[PDB]
Scaffold this active site. Structure first.
Site, PDB file in Angstrom:
ATOM      1  N   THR A  93       0.825  -1.202   0.000  1.00 48.04           N
ATOM      2  CA  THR A  93       0.000   0.000   0.000  1.00 48.04           C
ATOM      3  C   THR A  93       0.863   1.258   0.000  1.00 48.04           C
ATOM      4  O   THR A  93       0.429   2.323  -0.437  1.00 48.04           O
ATOM      5  CB  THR A  93      -0.942   0.033   1.216  1.00 48.04           C
ATOM      6  OG1 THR A  93      -0.170   0.117   2.420  1.00 48.04           O
ATOM      7  CG2 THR A  93      -1.801  -1.222   1.257  1.00 48.04           C
ATOM      8  N   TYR A  94       2.088   1.119   0.496  1.00 49.82           N
ATOM      9  CA  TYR A  94       3.040   2.224   0.553  1.00 49.82           C
ATOM     10  C   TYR A  94       3.513   2.630  -0.840  1.00 49.82           C
ATOM     11  O   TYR A  94       3.862   3.786  -1.078  1.00 49.82           O
ATOM     12  CB  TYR A  94       4.239   1.837   1.422  1.00 49.82           C
ATOM     13  CG  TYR A  94       4.819   0.481   1.082  1.00 49.82           C
ATOM     14  CD1 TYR A  94       4.408  -0.663   1.756  1.00 49.82           C
ATOM     15  CD2 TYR A  94       5.773   0.342   0.082  1.00 49.82           C
ATOM     16  CE1 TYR A  94       4.932  -1.903   1.445  1.00 49.82           C
ATOM     17  CE2 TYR A  94       6.302  -0.895  -0.236  1.00 49.82           C
ATOM     18  CZ  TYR A  94       5.878  -2.014   0.449  1.00 49.82           C
ATOM     19  OH  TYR A  94       6.404  -3.246   0.134  1.00 49.82           O
ATOM     20  N   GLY A  95       3.520   1.666  -1.753  1.00 48.24           N
ATOM     21  CA  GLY A  95       4.018   1.880  -3.099  1.00 48.24           C
ATOM     22  C   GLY A  95       4.787   0.664  -3.578  1.00 48.24           C
ATOM     23  O   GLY A  95       4.487  -0.461  -3.182  1.00 48.24           O
ATOM     24  N   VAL A  96       5.779   0.886  -4.434  1.00 48.36           N
ATOM     25  CA  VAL A  96       6.620  -0.204  -4.917  1.00 48.36           C
ATOM     26  C   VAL A  96       8.091   0.095  -4.648  1.00 48.36           C
ATOM     27  O   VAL A  96       8.631   1.089  -5.135  1.00 48.36           O
ATOM     28  CB  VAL A  96       6.423  -0.458  -6.425  1.00 48.36           C
ATOM     29  CG1 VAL A  96       7.167  -1.715  -6.846  1.00 48.36           C
ATOM     30  CG2 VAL A  96       4.944  -0.580  -6.760  1.00 48.36           C
TER      31      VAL A  96
ATOM     32  N   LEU B  97      19.813  -1.598   2.529  1.00 50.89           N
ATOM     33  CA  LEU B  97      20.191  -2.548   3.565  1.00 50.89           C
ATOM     34  C   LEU B  97      19.801  -3.949   3.108  1.00 50.89           C
ATOM     35  O   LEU B  97      18.920  -4.104   2.260  1.00 50.89           O
ATOM     36  CB  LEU B  97      19.533  -2.202   4.904  1.00 50.89           C
ATOM     37  CG  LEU B  97      20.019  -0.917   5.586  1.00 50.89           C
ATOM     38  CD1 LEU B  97      19.256   0.306   5.087  1.00 50.89           C
ATOM     39  CD2 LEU B  97      19.927  -1.032   7.101  1.00 50.89           C
TER      40      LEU B  97
ATOM     41  N   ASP C   2       4.974   3.258  14.035  1.00 44.90           N
ATOM     42  CA  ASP C   2       4.819   2.069  13.196  1.00 44.90           C
ATOM     43  C   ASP C   2       5.982   1.091  13.358  1.00 44.90           C
ATOM     44  O   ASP C   2       6.498   0.557  12.375  1.00 44.90           O
ATOM     45  CB  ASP C   2       4.677   2.476  11.726  1.00 44.90           C
ATOM     46  CG  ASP C   2       4.025   1.396  10.881  1.00 44.90           C
ATOM     47  OD1 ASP C   2       3.311   0.542  11.446  1.00 44.90           O
ATOM     48  OD2 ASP C   2       4.226   1.403   9.648  1.00 44.90           O
TER      49      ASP C   2
ATOM     50  N   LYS D   5       7.495  -2.130  13.697  1.00 39.94           N
ATOM     51  CA  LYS D   5       7.279  -3.557  13.497  1.00 39.94           C
ATOM     52  C   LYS D   5       8.470  -4.120  12.722  1.00 39.94           C
ATOM     53  O   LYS D   5       9.112  -3.387  11.969  1.00 39.94           O
ATOM     54  CB  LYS D   5       5.957  -3.812  12.761  1.00 39.94           C
ATOM     55  CG  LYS D   5       5.808  -3.073  11.442  1.00 39.94           C
ATOM     56  CD  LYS D   5       4.485  -3.416  10.775  1.00 39.94           C
ATOM     57  CE  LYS D   5       4.328  -2.702   9.442  1.00 39.94           C
ATOM     58  NZ  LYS D   5       3.060  -3.080   8.757  1.00 39.94           N
TER      59      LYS D   5
ATOM     60  N   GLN E  68       9.170  -5.662  10.059  1.00 40.46           N
ATOM     61  CA  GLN E  68       9.346  -5.447   8.625  1.00 40.46           C
ATOM     62  C   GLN E  68       9.733  -4.003   8.315  1.00 40.46           C
ATOM     63  O   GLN E  68      10.149  -3.690   7.199  1.00 40.46           O
ATOM     64  CB  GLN E  68       8.074  -5.828   7.864  1.00 40.46           C
ATOM     65  CG  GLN E  68       6.808  -5.193   8.406  1.00 40.46           C
ATOM     66  CD  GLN E  68       5.555  -5.798   7.804  1.00 40.46           C
ATOM     67  OE1 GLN E  68       5.244  -5.586   6.632  1.00 40.46           O
ATOM     68  NE2 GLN E  68       4.833  -6.572   8.606  1.00 40.46           N
TER      69      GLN E  68
ATOM     70  N   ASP F  71      10.656   3.244   7.189  1.00 40.50           N
ATOM     71  CA  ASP F  71       9.241   3.471   6.905  1.00 40.50           C
ATOM     72  C   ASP F  71       8.625   4.478   7.873  1.00 40.50           C
ATOM     73  O   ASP F  71       7.935   4.099   8.818  1.00 40.50           O
ATOM     74  CB  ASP F  71       8.464   2.151   6.950  1.00 40.50           C
ATOM     75  CG  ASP F  71       7.323   2.111   5.952  1.00 40.50           C
ATOM     76  OD1 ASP F  71       7.038   1.020   5.412  1.00 40.50           O
ATOM     77  OD2 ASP F  71       6.713   3.172   5.703  1.00 40.50           O
TER      78      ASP F  71
END
EC number: 2.7.11.22
Lengths: 133, 296
Positions: B14-17, B83, B127, B129, B131, B145
Site C-alpha cells: 500500500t506504501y508503493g513499490v 540494507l 509504526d 514492526k 518489517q 518506513d
C-alpha cells in the site's frame, strides 16, 4: 519585520470570512497560521508572490503535516477555487506539491519556530486563535 | 534514470513499490521507492509528505538515510540507502536455529538509540514492526518506513489510532484513549524484543478485542492499582475476563534476570510509568553490549 507582508493577507475580506467560518480553529489555528508564514519565508516568496492561492496551499500543506484529521482541511478547496472546487482541487494540490518542492521538503515546523514568529507581534488577533478540547 | 538501473523488485504494498537499484561505473546500491499517487488528485500522499519531511531533518546512524527525492509531475521516486533485509525475514530465517542473545541485545540497543533520537527531536514513529526495521551484513539495525510518523511538538493537534498492525499496538490505543505519546513506540519495541528471543509474536491478535485479550492473558487483566484510569477509558468494558499475570519465563524462557526486568518495564500498562528510550539505554541490560555480525 517580514511579518507585515504576512499580515496583509488577513485584511482581505474573503480571508476574514474564512477565519470566521473556522470557529473551532480546526484548520486555521494560530500555530498553523504561523507555519504558513514559515513556509512563506522558507520558499523565499517575494512580496509579489504573497497571493491568496499561495496562502491557501501553504495552509493546506500545514494541515497535511500537523493534522491527522484529514477531512476538515477539504473546507479550504471552495474558498480558494470557488463553487467549481470539486473539479479544481487536483490542480490546487499540484500547486501544494510544487510549494513543498520549493521549500526543499522542509515542511516540518518545530514549536520553537512557531513561538518565535508569534512573538514578533502578539497584538495581532490571529495569534489568539487558541484551540481547546 | 541517471547512473542507476533497477536490478530487482523488493516488495509491493500500500506504501508503493520498492525496488533495489544499482549503479555501474562505481557500485552504489540504493533502495528506489516509487510512491503511488492519489486517485482523485494525482497528488503526493500525506504519508509520503510526512515521511520525506521528517527524514530530511532526521540524521542518525540508527535511522535509514534519505539520499534524494526525484520529483516529476507524473512520478515520485524516493532514494534510500540499501540494507540487506528487514528484521522479520531475519527472524523467520532464524526461527529454528535461534538468534544469539548478544545480537538481540545489540539490535535492541541500537533501536533504542534511534528511537531516543526521534523522541528527543519530538518525533513519533508510530509504526515499529519487524518489517520496518532494516539490517545489514555488519550488525547494524535501522528504523525505516516513516510513513505513519509525525511530530508532536505543536500542542493540541489531532491524532489517529490506525498506527501499527495490532500485534505491536499499545493497549492505551486499543482502549481508545487518545492523547498518547512516546510510550506507544516503547511498547512496540517491547513486543519486538520478545519476538527476537522466542522468534514468535508476543501478542498475535486478529482484532482489537482479541489483541487486548492476548495482552491480558500474558500480562494480567489491568485494574486501577496498576493503571489509575483504566476503568474510565472509552473502550473499556466491565465484562473483561480477569486473568492473573504470568511469570516472565513462562512468557520468555531464555532471558536472564536483567532481561525480564527491562522487558517488564517496557510493557508497563501505564504510559506515564512506562520507561523512555533514554532510560532504557541506561538499563542494566546494556552492560556487556557489543556489535556482533549476523549470519545472513
Amino acid at each position: 519585520q517580514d511579518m507585515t507582508a504576512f499580515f496583509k493577507l488577513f485584511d482581505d475580506d474573503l480571508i476574514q470570512d474564512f477565519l470566521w467560518m473556522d470557529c473551532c480553529c480546526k484548520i486555521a489555528d494560530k500555530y498553523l497560521l504561523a507555519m504558513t508564514f514559515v513556509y512563506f519565508k522558507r520558499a523565499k516568496f517575494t512580496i509579489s508572490e504573497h497571493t491568496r492561492i499561495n496562502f491557501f496551499i501553504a495552509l493546506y500543506l500545514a494541515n497535511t503535516v500537523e493534522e491527522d484529521e484529514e477531512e476538515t482541511k477539504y473546507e479550504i478547496f471552495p474558498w480558494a477555487l470557488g463553487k467549481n472546487w470539486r473539479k479544481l482541487f487536483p490542480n490546487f494540490l499540484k500547486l501544494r506539491d510544487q510549494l513543498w518542492d520549493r521549500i526543499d521538503y522542509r515542511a516540518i515546523v518545530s514549536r520553537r519556530c512557531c513561538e518565535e514568529v508569534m512573538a514578533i507581534a502578539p497584538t495581532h488577533y490571529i495569534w489568539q486563535r487558541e484551540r481547546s478540547v | 534514470m541517471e547512473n542507476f538501473q533497477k536490478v530487482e523488485k523488493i516488495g509491493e504494498g500500500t506504501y508503493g513499490v520498492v525496488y533495489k537499484a544499482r549503479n555501474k561505473l562505481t557500485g552504489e546500491v540504493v533502495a528506489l521507492k516509487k510512491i503511488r499517487l492519489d486517485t482523485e488528485t494525482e497528488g503526493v500522499p500525506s504519508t509520503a509528505i510526512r515521511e520525506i519531511s521528517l527524514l530530511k531533518e532526521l540524521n542518525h546512524p540508527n535511522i535509514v538515510k534519505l539520499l534524494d527525492v526525484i520529483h516529476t509531475e507524473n512520478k515520485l521516486y524516493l532514494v534510500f540507502e540499501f540494507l540487506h533485509q528487514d528484521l522479520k525475514k531475519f527472524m523467520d530465517a532464524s526461527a529454528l536455529t535461534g538468534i544469539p542473545l548478544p545480537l538481540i541485545k545489540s539490535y535492541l540497543f541500537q533501536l533504542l538509540q534511534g528511537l531516543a533520537f526521534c523522541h528527543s527531536h519530538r518525533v513519533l514513529h508510530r509504526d515499529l514492526k519487524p518489517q520496518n526495521l532494516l539490517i545489514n551484513t555488519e550488525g547494524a539495525i535501522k528504523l525505516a518506513d516513516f510513513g505513519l510518523a509525525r511530530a508532536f511538538g505543536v500542542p493540541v493537534r489531532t491524532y489517529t489510532h490506525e498506527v501499527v498492525t495490532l500485534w505491536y499496538r499499545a493497549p492505551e490505543i486499543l482502549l481508545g484513549c487518545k492523547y498518547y505519546s512516546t510510550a506507544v513506540d516503547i511498547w512496540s519495541l517491547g513486543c519486538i524484543f520478545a519476538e527476537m528471543v522466542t522468534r514468535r509474536a508476543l501478542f498475535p491478535g486478529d482484532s482489537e478485542i482479541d489483541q487486548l485479550f492476548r495482552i491480558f492473558r500474558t500480562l494480567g487483566t489491568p485494574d486501577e492499582v496498576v493503571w489509575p484510569g483504566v476503568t474510565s477509558m472509552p473502550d473499556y468494558k466491565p465484562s473483561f475476563p480477569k486473568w492473573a499475570r504470568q511469570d516472565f519465563s513462562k512468557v520468555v524462557p531464555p532471558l536472564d534476570e536483567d532481561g525480564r526486568s527491562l522487558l517488564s518495564q517496557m510493557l508497563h500498562y501505564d504510559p506515564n510509568k512506562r520507561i523512555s528510550a533514554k532510560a532504557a539505554l541506561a538499563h542494566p541490560f546494556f552492560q556487556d553490549v557489543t556489535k556482533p555480525v549476523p549470519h545472513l
